Protein backbone atom coordinates (compact mmCIF):
# COMPACT_ATOMS: atom_id res chain seq x y z
CA UNK A 1 0.00 0.00 0.00
CA UNK A 2 0.96 3.61 -0.78
CA UNK A 3 -0.59 5.49 2.17
CA UNK A 4 2.66 5.91 4.17
CA UNK A 5 2.92 9.59 3.24
CA UNK A 6 -0.68 10.17 4.42
CA UNK A 7 0.12 8.33 7.67
CA UNK A 8 3.23 10.49 8.20
CA UNK A 9 1.13 13.64 7.71
CA UNK A 10 -1.21 12.32 10.40
CA UNK A 11 1.62 11.69 12.89
CA UNK A 12 3.14 15.16 12.37
CA UNK A 13 -0.27 16.84 12.60
CA UNK A 14 -1.34 15.21 15.85
CA UNK A 15 0.62 17.68 18.01
CA UNK A 16 0.26 20.74 15.80
CA UNK A 17 -2.28 23.48 16.57
CA UNK A 18 -4.15 24.74 13.51
CA UNK A 19 -6.09 26.98 15.87
CA UNK A 20 -4.05 29.01 18.39
CA UNK A 21 -3.72 27.25 21.76
CA UNK A 22 -5.81 24.29 20.59
CA UNK A 23 -3.91 21.03 20.00
CA UNK A 24 -5.07 19.20 16.86
CA UNK A 25 -5.90 16.12 18.94
CA UNK A 26 -8.76 18.14 20.51
CA UNK A 27 -10.07 19.52 17.21
CA UNK A 28 -11.22 17.24 14.42
CA UNK A 29 -11.52 20.05 11.86
CA UNK A 30 -8.13 21.58 12.72
CA UNK A 31 -6.44 18.17 12.55
CA UNK A 32 -7.63 17.46 8.98
CA UNK A 33 -6.47 21.00 8.03
CA UNK A 34 -2.92 20.30 9.19
CA UNK A 35 -2.94 16.89 7.44
CA UNK A 36 -4.09 18.53 4.20
CA UNK A 37 -1.50 21.34 4.50
CA UNK A 38 1.41 18.90 4.84
CA UNK A 39 0.18 16.93 1.82
CA UNK A 40 -0.35 20.13 -0.22
CA UNK A 41 -4.07 19.57 -0.66
CA UNK A 42 -6.42 22.59 -0.75
CA UNK A 43 -9.03 21.83 1.89
CA UNK A 44 -12.42 23.45 2.47
CA UNK A 45 -12.19 25.50 5.68
CA UNK A 46 -14.34 26.15 8.78
CA UNK A 47 -15.81 23.73 11.32
CA UNK A 48 -16.76 20.11 10.52
CA UNK A 49 -20.24 21.02 9.18
CA UNK A 50 -18.77 23.79 6.98
CA UNK A 51 -16.03 21.40 5.77
CA UNK A 52 -18.60 18.74 4.79
CA UNK A 53 -20.64 21.35 2.85
CA UNK A 54 -17.48 22.08 0.85
CA UNK A 55 -16.51 18.44 0.26
CA UNK A 56 -20.05 17.74 -0.96
CA UNK A 57 -19.61 20.58 -3.51
CA UNK A 58 -16.19 19.84 -4.96
CA UNK A 59 -14.95 16.30 -4.11
CA UNK A 60 -15.92 12.90 -5.56
CA UNK A 61 -18.03 10.73 -3.25
CA UNK A 62 -17.07 7.10 -2.73
CA UNK A 63 -19.61 4.25 -2.75
CA UNK A 64 -18.62 2.44 0.46
CA UNK A 65 -16.24 2.26 3.43
CA UNK A 66 -14.57 -0.67 1.65
CA UNK A 67 -13.91 1.58 -1.37
CA UNK A 68 -12.45 4.35 0.83
CA UNK A 69 -9.73 2.06 2.15
CA UNK A 70 -8.84 0.93 -1.38
CA UNK A 71 -8.41 4.56 -2.49
CA UNK A 72 -6.33 5.23 0.64
CA UNK A 73 -4.21 2.13 -0.17
CA UNK A 74 -3.68 3.70 -3.61
CA UNK A 75 -2.31 6.87 -1.95
CA UNK A 76 -5.32 9.20 -2.14
CA UNK A 77 -6.42 11.50 0.66
CA UNK A 78 -9.86 10.33 1.82
CA UNK A 79 -11.93 12.27 4.34
CA UNK A 80 -14.75 10.65 6.29
CA UNK A 81 -17.39 13.27 7.18
CA UNK A 82 -20.89 13.52 8.65
CA UNK A 83 -22.95 16.63 9.55
CA UNK A 84 -24.59 16.99 12.97
CA UNK A 85 -27.61 19.08 13.92
CA UNK A 86 -25.27 20.84 16.34
CA UNK A 87 -21.76 19.62 15.35
CA UNK A 88 -20.30 17.38 12.65
CA UNK A 89 -17.13 15.29 12.63
CA UNK A 90 -14.30 14.63 10.18
CA UNK A 91 -11.61 11.93 9.93
CA UNK A 92 -8.79 10.81 7.64
CA UNK A 93 -9.35 7.27 6.35
CA UNK A 94 -6.23 5.14 6.05
CA UNK A 95 -5.69 1.68 4.53
CA UNK A 96 -5.88 -1.64 6.38
CA UNK A 97 -8.39 -4.43 7.22
CA UNK A 98 -12.02 -3.37 7.78
CA UNK A 99 -13.60 -3.56 11.26
CA UNK A 100 -16.79 -5.69 11.21
CA UNK A 101 -16.04 -6.25 7.48
CA UNK A 102 -17.31 -2.70 6.79
CA UNK A 103 -15.64 0.21 8.61
CA UNK A 104 -12.19 1.48 7.49
CA UNK A 105 -9.28 2.51 9.74
CA UNK A 106 -8.88 6.23 10.45
CA UNK A 107 -7.05 9.10 12.16
CA UNK A 108 -9.04 11.86 13.86
CA UNK A 109 -8.89 14.42 16.68
CA UNK A 110 -11.76 15.24 19.03
CA UNK A 111 -12.85 17.72 21.70
CA UNK A 112 -14.58 14.68 23.28
CA UNK A 113 -11.22 13.35 24.51
CA UNK A 114 -9.86 9.84 23.90
CA UNK A 115 -13.31 8.46 23.04
CA UNK A 116 -13.48 10.53 19.88
CA UNK A 117 -9.82 10.37 18.97
CA UNK A 118 -8.12 7.87 16.68
CA UNK A 119 -4.44 7.35 15.81
CA UNK A 120 -5.00 4.68 13.15
CA UNK A 121 -6.15 1.70 15.24
CA UNK A 122 -9.82 2.71 15.68
CA UNK A 123 -12.12 2.41 12.70
CA UNK A 124 -14.75 4.99 11.78
CA UNK A 125 -17.13 2.45 13.32
CA UNK A 126 -15.49 3.00 16.69
CA UNK A 127 -15.35 6.81 16.48
CA UNK A 128 -18.90 7.45 15.28
CA UNK A 129 -21.58 5.60 17.25
CA UNK A 130 -23.67 2.65 16.04
CA UNK A 131 -26.36 4.77 14.34
CA UNK A 132 -24.04 7.36 12.73
CA UNK A 133 -21.43 4.91 11.39
CA UNK A 134 -23.63 3.63 8.53
CA UNK A 135 -24.50 7.20 7.49
CA UNK A 136 -20.91 8.27 6.73
CA UNK A 137 -19.78 10.06 3.59
CA UNK A 138 -16.32 9.30 2.16
CA UNK A 139 -14.73 11.96 -0.03
CA UNK A 140 -11.60 11.47 -2.17
CA UNK A 141 -9.19 14.05 -3.57
CA UNK A 142 -8.73 14.14 -7.36
CA UNK A 143 -4.97 13.49 -7.18
CA UNK A 144 -3.03 10.87 -5.26
CA UNK A 145 -0.68 12.42 -2.69
CA UNK A 146 1.78 9.51 -2.35
CA UNK A 147 3.92 7.97 -5.14
CA UNK A 148 5.89 4.74 -5.85
Numbering used by the authors: 3 to 150
Task: Please give the exact wording used by the authors of the publication that reports this structure.
Most importantly, the T6SS from the Gram-negative, pathogenic bacterium Pseudomonas aeruginosa was shown to inject at least three different effector molecules (named Tse1, Tse2, and Tse3; Type-6-Secretion-Exported) into the periplasmic space of competing cells. Tse1 was shown to be an amidase that cleaves the γ-D-glutamyl-l-meso-diaminopimelic acid amide bond of crosslinked PG, and Tse3 is a muramidase that cleaves the PG-backbone between the N-acetylmuramic acid and the N-acetylglucosamine moieties. As injection of effector proteins by the T6SS would also cause cell death of siblings, P. aeruginosa co-synthesizes the cognate immunity proteins Tsi1 and Tsi3 (Type-6-Secretion-Immunity) and shuttles them into their periplasmic space to confer resistance. Tse1 adopts the fold of N1pC/P60 papain-like cysteine peptidases, which are widespread among bacteria and of which homologues were identified in eukaryotes, phages, viruses, and archaea.
We crystallized P. aeruginosa Tse1 and obtained excellent data, for which experimental structure factor phases were obtained from a Single-wavelength Anomalous Diffraction (SAD) experiment on selenomethionine-substituted protein crystals. Subsequently, the model was refined against 2.6 Å resolution data. In both structures, four molecules per asymmetric unit were found which were virtually identical to each other. Both models show excellent stereochemistry, with 96% of the residues in the preferred regions of the Ramachandran plot. Since DSB2 was observed in the highly redundant SAD data, collected at the selenium peak, its absence in the native structure is unlikely to be caused by radiation damage. However, once we excluded any reducing agents from the purification procedure of native Tse1 protein and setup crystallization experiments, crystals with similar morphology as observed for selenomethionine-substituted proteins were observed suggesting that in those crystals DSB2 had been formed too. Thus, we argue that DSB2 formation or not is not an experimental artifact. Indeed, it is possible that in cytosolic Tse1 DSB2 is open, and that it closes after transportation into the periplasmic space by T6SS.
